[PDB]
Symmetry: C3
Subunit: 243 residues, 3 copies
Amino acid sequence: NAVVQLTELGNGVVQITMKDESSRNGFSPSIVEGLRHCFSVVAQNQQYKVVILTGYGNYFSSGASKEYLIRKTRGEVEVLDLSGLILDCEIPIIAAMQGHSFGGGLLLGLYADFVVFSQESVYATNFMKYGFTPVGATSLILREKLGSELAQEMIYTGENYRGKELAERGIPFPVVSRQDVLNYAQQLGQKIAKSPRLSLVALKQHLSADIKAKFPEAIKKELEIHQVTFNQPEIASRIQQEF
Amino acid sequence: NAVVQLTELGNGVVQITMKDESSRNGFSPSIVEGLRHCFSVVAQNQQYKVVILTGYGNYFSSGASKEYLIRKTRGEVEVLDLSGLILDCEIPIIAAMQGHSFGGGLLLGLYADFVVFSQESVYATNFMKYGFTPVGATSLILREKLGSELAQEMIYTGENYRGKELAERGIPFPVVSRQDVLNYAQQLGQKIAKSPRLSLVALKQHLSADIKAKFPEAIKKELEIHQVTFNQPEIASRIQQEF
Amino acid sequence: NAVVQLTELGNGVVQITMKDESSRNGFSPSIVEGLRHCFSVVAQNQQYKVVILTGYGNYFSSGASKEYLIRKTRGEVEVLDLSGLILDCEIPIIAAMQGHSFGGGLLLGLYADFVVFSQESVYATNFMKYGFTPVGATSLILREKLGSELAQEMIYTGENYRGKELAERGIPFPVVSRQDVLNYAQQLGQKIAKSPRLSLVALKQHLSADIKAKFPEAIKKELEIHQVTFNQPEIASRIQQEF
């Protein structure tokens, strides 16, 4: 079966589940194509009103693979950007992050309208751990959703934070036990799905307008800086040591 | 006596109390005219430095009446907007929300410079409960004052939140026992009233400038979307069932 | 010895310590010249990656002296502005506020990229206590870093808040025991210093861009209002009574 599956939960709530065990829900060709396909099925089905995006087991999304980053050091690829994919969805998305989220994987979840974290799992914007600056409008999104101070610490350090540590820090999102994350997202989705679809779509467009306006320039600015900081002598070795 | 009364608390602190029991401090002609009158008396009395706006009993403001909304479905009225009224006041306002606040009633309080919530009372931006989008620059104000995440949940769900639940959620305002709300507002007003009036007025103008700049466009945008989402087939029936 | 001293902590982390006991780390000529000198030494040493700015004993910075304010009432001076000095530093700064911070002294710390507060010490933007409006882009910075609601209360009241009270209020920064403040800042500095300097500088420039864009107009606007509110009949007497 496909590594990304769409299921119906009732009342217009649907669940898109990522299960690429081989990459631990990394940004693999299978995951990218599966997400694109599942979101296209959603766009086509006018009865759907809320999407819950979730992972499998211990992983929500581990983002770009270390093998991919190494390939990048030899200038062999370009930078993947899934923002368009998620941001194009016209109905509300809840990211039920029941497992770990790293790098673009944390951003993937934070692109959503609502986010649920697991107490026991680990979250990081770890670009700076490898020694280079973020991509994907990380600072725009993280500052908007997490608050400027938490965003800044996470981005500068690149460190791994448990959900429980983030909660203690005053993150504005629910942080619950791993076994409760998806259930929490589902209950919230059902509350939201009580509204007419037309109203949900209109409201989401209204609420997203300010960030969407700022997004293309943010992505561009971060890419330009990333190209400079990634292409420095010591980066290849730093990436080697994170294996 | 008038349903809206102004009393002096000393040192330039005044209290405007809404007590329209018949409408439960809804946006009745009596409440609108009483607020306009009390704020005009305030504008004229240069010795006043801080206004505390409060309700009576279990209600701060229940906003627009369900009978009014039904009338609206038959296109019989226009949309009331009290923002100009509150935002024109040149001295600081503290909304002592000792009781429930719904819809425009919660916005009325959130237009103020400082807000105090009751632990036991219920608060909602419930437009989406009836199935249509907000008016009154709800998303501008709620996102600015409550933070984007709480604002988003409240707006999308339209649900009733107890003050205690909001406090647990990390709302940036004081949430205290119902019997302590007005006393808390009064003590804060007295602290603020220690400054010269000229300084209070100058500071308030400075601090309010950014939001006031964004307000006319926000009100307009929300009205346009509200007109579309309100005038859909199923709305009349949804309103009927909220009685 | 000089009242402002730079020491190396290892791995590119340096500490700038203010110790003007005579003024309690006020904005004295010695402190201003010492800060300028220590930041110039930092700018010149490309091996440095993080600055920790701290005070001595019970004081981080007491800001402008009351004797200076009195001199100002007779129109005898101009307004000191250390923002340029701190904001010009191209590497990340952590303000380890182990002691009290007042007025410009609190702003001095809040200009930094990261801030650590002491539980037992007192913090105030106390301009309004003397009866006039702030300078130094206080409302821009405080609203951005502390959140709009806490910022507003602090600015309007001008009152002294213990670190513990701020923590209870949900300030987005660490608040720890006085004896732990500098150690906490040092550990954070060491985490940040793991990144290449080029990346730290590029990231800081990116993250600071939005506020830096708004800063010159904010400083100007606040100065203009301050000139009006400071030069009112009763201010001299209010300043006299704060001695």
